[PDB]
């Protein structure tokens, strides 16, 4: 438990929640079938689900930084795909 790692974990939690919620909201709002991985946005939701399953407390800084940049990437990407009305 270094503050450096604790801090990164705090930031990752907030960002991953933001991204997940944008995807969850859109999937729910557009009434998309959660059990259909063929549907692009659902596939993405399922991918985010796997990502969140990990115990971040078992990661090193380099691994945490890697996870962080994962969520920057999905944040960027999710905004791009969700353009329906």
């Amino acid at each position: 438990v270094t503050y450096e790692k604790t801090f990164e974990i705090e930031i990752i939690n907030e960002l991953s929640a933001s991204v997940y919620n944008r995807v969850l909201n859109y999937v729910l709002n557009h009434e998309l079938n959660k059990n259909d991985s063929q549907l692009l946005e659902v596939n993405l939701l399922n991918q985010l689900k796997l990502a969140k399953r990990v115990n971040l407390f078992d990661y090193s800084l380099e691994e945490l930084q890697a996870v962080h940049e994962y969520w920057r990437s999905m944040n960027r990407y999710s905004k791009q795909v969700l353009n329906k009305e």
Binding site: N13, E14, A17, S18, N21, R22, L24, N25, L28, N29
Partner: peptide, 14 residues
């Protein structure tokens, strides 16, 4: 269980 992780989950958040 963390209150703040739910704020953006409001249906009409955006």
């Amino acid at each position: 269980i963390d209150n703040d992780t739910f704020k953006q989950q409001h249906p009409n958040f955006d």
